[PDB]
Design a protein around this ligand. Structure first.
Ligand SMILES: Cc1cc2nc3c(=O)[nH]c(=O)nc-3n(C[C@H](O)[C@H](O)[C@H](O)COP(=O)(O)OP(=O)(O)OC[C@H]3O[C@@H](n4cnc5c(N)ncnc54)[C@H](O)[C@@H]3O)c2cc1C
Ligand SMILES: Cc1c[nH]c(=O)[nH]c1=O
Length: 415
């Protein structure tokens, strides 16, 4: 009987502990389950997921292996596949998310054979004993990347079942799959890594790898990426790996402070006067605030599904501080428009840029919509491509008075 390798947010063959753990014991058959709990989202994210699943199957086929794709509830579909294949056991990577744990417990209950969960590759585990709310102390535990596991050269033959639906993303998607992701990593490392420290703040984010969409679905292992960068070494590598750590820090936070998905890490903001005005929300959501920066950011987001880190922190803070729009609603809408939309990461990003308790970031730090745009964008070429209308980062009829909205926040914040 074969061993089933169940892929979730790990659509890759490189550095995959569950895949090798099973392969070492005997023939394997891969499996992906299209779960309504994950697929019932915006078209752009559903398609991104589906296309990477299609790419995984091709990767299995190219090696002579078999990848099944079933649709439905994991606790019904995994056992079904196990029965049909007469599998001896099921192997997967551990998931520490609320849904992940609920789902896997249900599957374990329905499964008549063992379900073996292995640690997913990380730079720093999220379930670390000590709980840190600040990044620096957390990052000090990192002692370099462990070596990544190799991909199999060829795969044992087996039967293939299931069809992979085709969805209209409603926009241009990056090239799906591990091969594409690996080529991107190489390029970035050979060309951009060297100056990353000096180019990682551009508003158009072209100094970065643009690999987040792949990381989000596990198409690329963070351990492999870090290991590669560290082989290059230098200031660039040090700083870039530090960013990868931020991703792990994000999972660490949500793991130790689950309640932060509900309320700010910083208790003194549990009762901030969030003014839920449906009119302002659309203005922000649509990028019609009048502020060149925020507007161009939200317009690129709606069109591309991607946005640089610098752009995200502005657009995110503007909504929280300059408009006092509640974060809960804003972070959800934000996540849904992102190809790399990751619950834990997006949440820490908002509770950080929003001065809500992450990394003890101070509330008094308030971005200046125009300065930011001139200090992080040359001939305003970025603003030109996404908001041609605006002559410059000059507030041409703001939906609120910037200077006022600022003092308004600072005022409220001091309590
Ligand atoms: C309000 C807000 C919301 C965000 N929501 C998300 C989200 O839902 N999903 C997501 O992947 N990123 C999110 N980010 C973090 C971040 O902006 C991106 O990971 C980054 O822009 C990706 O571009 P890149 O791949 O070129 O990154 P690079 O600069 O090339 O960095 C490489 C990798 O490190 C990780 N990384 C980099 N910066 C951060 C960071 N600040 N926090 C966590 N991980 C980081 C990413 O996986 C990234 O692909 C958010 C940031 C903010 C301020
Ligand atoms: C959390 C965080 C810290 N620093 C950044 O530049 N971006 C982020 O999202």
């Amino acid at each position: 009987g074969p061993l089933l390798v169940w892929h979730r947010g790990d659509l890759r063959l490189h550095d995959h502990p569950a895949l090798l753990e099973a392969l070492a014991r005997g023939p394997v058959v891969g499996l992906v389950v299209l779960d309504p709990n994950n697929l019932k989202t915006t078209p752009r994210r559903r398609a991104w997921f589906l296309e990477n699943v299609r790419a995984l199957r091709e990767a299995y086929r190219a090696r002579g292996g078999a990848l099944w794709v079933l649709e439905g509830l994991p606790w019904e579909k995994v056992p079904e596949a196990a029965r049909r294949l007469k599998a001896k056991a099921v192997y997967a990577l551990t998931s520490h998310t609320p849904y992940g744990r609920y789902r896997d417990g249900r599957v374990r209950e329905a499964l008549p054979v063992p379900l073996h969960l292995l640690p997913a590759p990380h730079l720093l585990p999220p379930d670390l004993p000590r709980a840190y709310r600040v990044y620096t102390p957390f990052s000090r535990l990192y002692r370099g990347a462990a070596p990544p596991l190799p991909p199999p050269e060829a795969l044992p033959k087996g039967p293939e079942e299931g069809e992979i639906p085709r969805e209209d993303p409603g926009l241009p998607l990056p090239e799906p799959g591990e091969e594409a992701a690996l080529a991107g990593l190489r390029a970035f490392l050979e060309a951009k890594l060297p100056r990353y420290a000096e180019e990682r703040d551009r508003l158009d984010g072209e100094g970065g790898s643009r690999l987040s969409p792949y990381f989000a679905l596990g198409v690329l292992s963070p351990r492999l990426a870090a290991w590669e960068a560290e082989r290059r070494g230098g200031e660039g590598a040090r700083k870039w790996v530090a960013e990868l750590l931020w991703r792990d820090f994000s999972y660490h936070l949500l793991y130790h402070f689950p309640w932060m998905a509900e309320r700010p890490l910083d208790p003194r903001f549990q009762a901030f006067p969030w003014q839920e005005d449906e009119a302002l929300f659309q203005a922000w959501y649509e990028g019609k605030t009048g502020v060149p920066l925020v507007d161009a950011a939200m317009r690129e987001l709606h069109a591309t599904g991607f946005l640089s880190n610098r752009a995200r922190m502005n657009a995110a803070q503007f909504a929280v501080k300059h408009l006092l729009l509640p974060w809960k609603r804003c972070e959800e809408a934000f996540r849904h428009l992102l190809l790399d939309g990751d619950r834990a990461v997006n949440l820490q990003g908002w509770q950080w840029a929003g001065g809500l308790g992450v990394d003890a970031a101070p509330y008094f730090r308030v971005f200046n919509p125009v300065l930011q745009g001139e200090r992080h964008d040359p001939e305003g070429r970025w603003l030109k491509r996404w908001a041609p209308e605006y002559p410059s980062y000059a507030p041409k009829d703001p939906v609120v008075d910037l200077e006022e909205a600022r003092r308004r926040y600072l005022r409220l914040a001091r309590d």
